[PDB]
């Protein structure tokens, strides 16, 4: 959502799925996330070496109220506005739940049907996952996992 709330990483010899799994359990990320405690929203950006087409997306929450997935194409450049929505901002916790810490770990699968078609049809080498949690700013909220499925 803005550079200081965005953790950018290179996914060199790994696809988006592997890059994410490694990012999320990475000490550097956990320390970065710690440094951003108290923040209403954070994102991670996966810089893919090879552009990929994303069939569907599985998301495992870790205390986020909303999650959104956007995609971008680095060639030519890519500012914030040039990102295209892949998975529209989606609910994982209510404000009540956010405050009570109840059901922080919902999993939702989003098949081709639930993604933005125009975007899911294209290929991308930037994947931005945005986690919003305005109701529990102080928790180290994010995702347990995010998986991208490709042909």
């Amino acid at each position: 959502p803005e550079i200081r709330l965005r953790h950018v990483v290179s996914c060199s010899s790994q696809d988006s799925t592997h890059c994410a799994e490694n990012l999320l359990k990475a000490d550097t990320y956990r320390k970065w996330r710690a440094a951003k405690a108290g923040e209403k929203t954070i994102s991670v950006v996966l810089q893919l070496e090879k552009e990929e087409q994303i069939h569907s997306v599985d998301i495992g929450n870790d205390g986020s109220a909303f999650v959104e997935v956007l995609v971008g194409s680095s060639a030519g450049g890519a500012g914030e506005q040039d990102y295209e929505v892949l998975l529209v901002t989606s609910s994982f916790m209510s404000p009540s739940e956010s405050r009570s810490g109840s059901n922080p770990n919902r999993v939702r699968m989003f098949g081709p049907d639930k993604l933005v078609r125009a975007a899911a049809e294209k290929r991308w080498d930037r994947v931005k996952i945005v986690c919003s949690q305005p109701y529990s700013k102080d928790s180290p909220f994010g995702l347990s996992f995010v998986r991208f499925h490709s042909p």
Partner: protein, 194 residues
């Protein structure tokens, strides 16, 4: 008539009208929910017309059309002589004329315009909020909602993404739920002049 629609409806009559509408609706099926909205819901001493929002658990955004859910209610209010005329007969909206009952000797009440909208259950409270108003209130509420990254319309409240793209409709089980999302302290229906 003609001159009738331009008359104001005292809150007292609106209250009598509400009873007839809610009683008949509850009698048809207690799972129905009906709410008289508009300035009446905001506590106004008088109204220009009666606006009823109807929902039923069986009718949702995802379900098939269910016009019978509305027609059944409209026909019953005709049967009890409350709705005296039909202007528009829609699948999801009825627009017509109604009139309170009077005694054999008592003077007849003026005919009143009445709208009845059938709204999917999952869009109901957004509808109740919208149609309660006021217009100025709604405008203020929408503005604050945007500032907070939400778009509220007649149907839904949706989170706006980082490029401004509205997300999925958020589950709303009450008006209170909507205020909660945008972190506004609840404004009671009768506290919504502005």
């Amino acid at each position: 008539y003609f001159e009738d629609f331009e008359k104001r409806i005292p809150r007292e009559e609106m209250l009598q009208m509400q009873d007839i509408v809610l009683n008949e609706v509850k009698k048809l099926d207690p799972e129905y929910i009906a709410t008289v909205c508009g300035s009446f819901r905001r506590g106004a001493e008088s109204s220009g017309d009666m606006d009823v929002l109807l929902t039923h658990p069986n009718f949702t955004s995802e379900s098939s059309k269910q016009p019978k859910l509305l027609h059944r209610v409209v026909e019953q209010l005709q049967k009890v002589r409350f709705i005296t005329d039909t202007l528009s007969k829609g699948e999801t909206k009825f627009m017509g004329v109604c009139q309170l009952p009077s005694e054999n000797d008592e003077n007849e009440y003026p005919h009143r315009r009445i709208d009845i909208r059938l709204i999917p259950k999952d869009q109901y409270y957004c509808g109740v909020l919208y149609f309660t108003g006021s217009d100025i209130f709604n405008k203020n509420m929408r503005a604050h909602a945007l500032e907070k990254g939400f778009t509220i319309n007649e149907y839904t409240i949706r989170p706006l993404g980082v490029t401004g793209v509205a997300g999925e409709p958020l589950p709303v089980d009450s008006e209170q739920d909507i205020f909660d999302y945008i972190q506004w302290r609840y404004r009671e229906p009768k506290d919504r002049s502005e």
